Ligand binder design. Structure first.
Ligand SMILES: O=c1[nH]cnc2c1ncn2[C@@H]1O[C@H](COP(=O)(O)O)[C@@H](O)[C@H]1O
Ligand SMILES: *Cc1c(COP(=O)(O)OP(=O)(O)O)cnc(C)c1O
Lengths: 823, 69
């Protein structure tokens, strides 16, 4: 027994040992040899050779949190946007050097190998990327943190561009498996659907329930050189498989073939209205998760530390639950259910624990997005939690009766049940009522939740409403994607910045130093050169590596206004044709996003964006002064490639629309200047960098409301501006579309008659901004120094701060960048 | 109208050539709500919850349609 120990298992940065474990895994774990090993085969042996170093400190970290028994906090989210783990695990584990040299000796190229890895299709967007930067920051500042959520077999779609129209292919990333996960079939948990509530004696008894088993997979997430490794636990669904003769449902009829597939694709598919599968997926993750949580509470040396019930009295001192958005919300009615029906606490003690346990992050601004479920759906599948949720509602509405007596209209505005045709339950109100801290995600966004969207809740409990501005992590989004900038920042100010980013302010002393200025412009020239190469080698175009690299990589929605940007590109076009010989700053405009299958404007937009570019990049007079490229199937591996290259960050959402914007911050950090409205994340980065160093432009949020007030009448603009009047007629006549003139007919009308986001309003000033942009560009030394002021001011946007603030201000635990002894 | 004669019919409103004009320039609803007082009045009855006292906010998507699209 005590001699079964982790101790003698690793002589790390040693090339001769890493060669050894390489050859162990290729052969013994993969049961392959060099005569038949593929690059995938060698990709997996390396994966595993690095993994052994991982699980060893998973080990040590997790032994250490059990001995030390800290507040350990469960980050629940239904999408974890991870993307490629190898280089990120090596750099974080300090193994990058010895592994590269090692594979160099084995005569394998590690970069060829690192591109075999499939982009972890657990996520889709922001909500998911945010979960992955937050898990990195929580390791680095050694928190006892767990990321929880479903395992999606099929990611979401992997896009293809066939003929300028978008095609969704599927991401079967788990095809040759995943070397970074450990299946734990041992810990498979039941999760019940449907049923009937038998109100028996001391309680209620949820009977006749269908079961779906949740089987968990574990994945390790390493810190920045601190030897803590934390866990990411993703759940997979498995139907019970008695379905053959055992149950006597069957024999006679196996039409409950359906049970087993309606269970299975809980885990299969990401999403992507009121569909029972979303609700079964969300409740799937909550239920499994919280049984793990209370399993670890009563086990984690607290089965010894009972004093009363193994009391839930001290549950909020050992658990923190973060409801990232309204997808986890049945965490509040499920933790009561367990506490109240299964253990036996009464409702007021059990409620005490829930509210002190639960905290809720909101990411939406428009009331039209907040999530809401029909009471007839919840009665059918969760009939017991409909009960609890009504009692939660009743008692909350008497609290509001305490506080504003006489009020009739707040009872009904504030309530969890919503009236109309289709009686709904408002999930955002559930969260506020059973959580002890509600937070937004950028200053303005948390204020307009306090001021308009949740205000009658802001009045009953103003204490609740916090804000914790998002962040990007410096490991993967500066060190990893950009070594060249990492390095030259390190010569000057040292390595602590990577685990302490505000001290990038130190850089501001080197503003006028020409060695920094030059070096800083050299690395971009490097980065652009290499990205220019990737744009030929994997996808194709003839980029001019000297051009101003204008990239917009955002979700193709109307409100994300890529169309704006298209009016501007067509503008540049028309000028280079009208005035063939005026000096124009050459640009390469790159736009990228996944449509959202079913959203027909977005499919029409990518079409515009390809054919503008079919026109201009082939037309002889524009030469190499302008090119427009669409960046296909934008995902995390492409972000770490094009964000290093970019000179201009295209952040143009109608103002008042964004809640924040994490690609914004990534771009700043790598010396890319921002053109952008005074919205979302742009505001505090303008505030850091100084507005002189930002390209702000277009109608501030005040002016939006004004324009709505009197009515946005787009024709007036058409009729003042002669460029605008012209590019509309070019779209319409078929100049961009000669085999189907009439194609952009529904984009032209939209803009012209019912633009809900006012593209035309900000058109004039947008391109005036753009002209500023190109000028400064044509002045290296002053271009390259704005960058330096921007990068140097990046401190407020490292996710290490966002978590440090979550830690102190909502969860109640202290940060620590201390290196656990280990390996 | 033509077999009865115009005089025997109550014809009205925007004829087509006019709707095509108001589209050519862009129908800005707001203007009409701000000339006409009784219009203002009913819009403001719809949003205040006059007709809807238990969920006042109920005809809000009607009211916004009317107002903005
Ligand atoms: O009581 C314990 N003492 C020491 N280490 C433990 C104990 N229970 C769990 N561990 C560690 O915790 C890891 C995770 O277990 P879980 O958190 O219960 O799922 C194991 O792989 C062990 O390293
Ligand atoms: C950072 C990031 C994101 C985040 O995109 P944004 O927050 O900038 O805005 P939306 O596009 O509107 O969500 C999404 N995808 C990847 C790959 C990435 O690195």
């Amino acid at each position: 027994r005590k001699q079964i120990s982790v101790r003698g298992l690793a002589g790390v940065e040693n090339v001769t040992e890493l060669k050894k474990n390489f050859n162990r895994h290729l052969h013994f774990t993969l049961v392959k040899d060099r005569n038949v090993a593929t690059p995938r085969d060698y990709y997996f042996a390396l994966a595993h050779t690095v993994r052994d170093h991982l699980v060893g400190r998973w080990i040590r970290t997790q032994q250490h949190y059990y001995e030390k028994d800290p507040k350990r906090i469960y980050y629940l989210s239904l999408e974890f946007y991870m993307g490629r783990t190898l280089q990120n695990t090596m750099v974080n584990l300090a193994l990058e050097n010895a592994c590269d040299e090692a594979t160099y000796q084995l005569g394998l190229d590690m970069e060829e190998l690192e591109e075999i890895e499939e982009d972890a299709g657990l996520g889709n967007g922001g909500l998911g990327r945010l979960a992955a930067c937050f898990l990195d920051s929580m390791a680095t500042l050694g928190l006892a943190a767990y990321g929880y959520g479903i395992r999606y077999e099929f990611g979401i779609f992997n896009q293809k561009i066939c003929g300028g129209w978008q095609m969704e292919e599927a991401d079967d990333w788990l095809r040759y498996g995943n070397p970074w996960e450990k299946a734990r079939p041992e810990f498979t948990l039941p999760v019940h659907f449907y049923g009937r509530v038998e109100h028996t004696s001391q309680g209620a008894k949820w009977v006749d329930t269908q079961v779906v088993l949740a089987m968990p997979y574990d994945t390790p997430v390493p810190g920045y050189r601190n030897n803590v490794v934390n866990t990411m636990r993703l759940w997979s669904a498995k139907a019970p498989n008695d379905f053959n003769l055992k149950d006597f449902n069957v024999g006679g009829y196996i039409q409950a073939v359906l049970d087993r597939n309606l269970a299975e694709n809980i885990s299969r598919v990401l999403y992507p209205e009121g569909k029972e599968l979303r609700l079964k997926q969300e409740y799937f993750v909550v239920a499994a998760t919280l049984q793990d949580i209370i399993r670890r509470f009563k086990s984690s040396k607290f089965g010894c530390r009972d004093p009363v019930r193994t009391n839930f009295d001290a549950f909020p001192d050992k658990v923190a639950i973060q409801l990232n958005d309204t997808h986890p919300s049945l965490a509040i009615p499920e933790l009561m259910r367990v506490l109240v029906d299964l253990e036996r606490l009464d409702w007021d003690k059990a409620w005490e624990v829930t509210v002190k346990t639960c905290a809720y992050t909101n990411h939406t601004v428009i009331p039209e997005a907040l999530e809401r479920w029909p009471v007839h759906l919840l009665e059918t599948l969760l009939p017991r939690h409909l009960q609890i949720i009504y009692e939660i509602n009743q008692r909350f509405l008497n609290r509001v009766a305490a506080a504003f007596p006489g009020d009739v209209d707040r009872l009904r505005r504030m309530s969890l049940v919503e009236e109309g045709a289709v009686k709904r339950i408002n999930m955002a109100h559930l969260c506020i009522a059973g959580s002890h801290a509600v937070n937004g995600v950028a200053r303005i966004h948390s204020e307009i939740l306090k001021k308009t969207i949740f205000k009658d809740f802001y009045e009953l409990e103003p204490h609740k409403f916090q804000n914790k501005t998002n962040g990007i992590t410096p490991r993967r989004w500066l060190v990893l994607c950009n070594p060249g900038l990492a390095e030259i920042i390190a010569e000057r100010i040292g390595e602590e910045y990577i685990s302490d980013l505000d001290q990038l302010r130190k850089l501001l002393s080197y503003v006028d130093d020409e060695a920094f200025i030059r070096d800083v412009a050299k690395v971009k020239q490097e980065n652009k050169l290499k990205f220019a190469a990737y744009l030929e080698r994997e996808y194709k175009v003839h980029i001019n590596p000297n051009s101003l690299f204008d990239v917009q990589v955002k979700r193709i929605h109307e409100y994300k206004r890529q169309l704006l940007n298209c009016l501007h590109v067509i503008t540049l076009y028309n000028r280079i044709k009208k005035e063939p010989n005026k000096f124009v700053v050459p640009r390469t405009v790159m736009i990228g996003g996944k449509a959202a299958p079913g959203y027909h404007m977005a499919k029409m937009i990518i079409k515009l964006i390809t054919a503008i570019g079919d026109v201009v990049n082939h037309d002889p007079v524009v030469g190499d002064r302008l090119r427009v490229i669409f960046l296909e199937n934008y995902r995390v591996s492409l972000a770490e490639k094009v964000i290093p290259a970019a000179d201009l960050s295209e952040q143009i959402s109608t103002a008042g629309t964004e809640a924040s914007g994490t690609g914004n911050m990534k771009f700043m950090l790598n010396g890319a200047l921002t053109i952008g409205t005074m919205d979302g994340a742009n505001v505090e980065m303008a505030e850091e960098a100084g507005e002189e160093n930002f390209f702000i432009f277009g109608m501030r949020v005040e002016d939006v409301d004004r324009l709505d007030q009197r009515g946005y009448n787009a024709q007036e603009y058409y009729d003042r501006i002669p460029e605008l009047r012209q590019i509309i007629e070019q779209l319409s006549s078929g100049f961009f579309s000669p085999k189907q003139p009439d194609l952009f007919k529904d984009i032209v009308n939209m803009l012209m008659h019912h633009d809900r986001f006012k593209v035309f309003a900000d058109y004039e000033e947008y391109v005036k901004c753009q002209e500023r942009v190109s000028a400064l560009y044509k002045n290296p030394r002053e271009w390259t120094r704005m960058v330096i002021r921007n990068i140097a001011t990046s401190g407020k946007f490292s996710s290490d701060r966002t978590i440090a603030q979550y830690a102190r201000e909502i969860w109640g635990v202290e940060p620590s960048r201390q290196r656990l002894p280990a390996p």
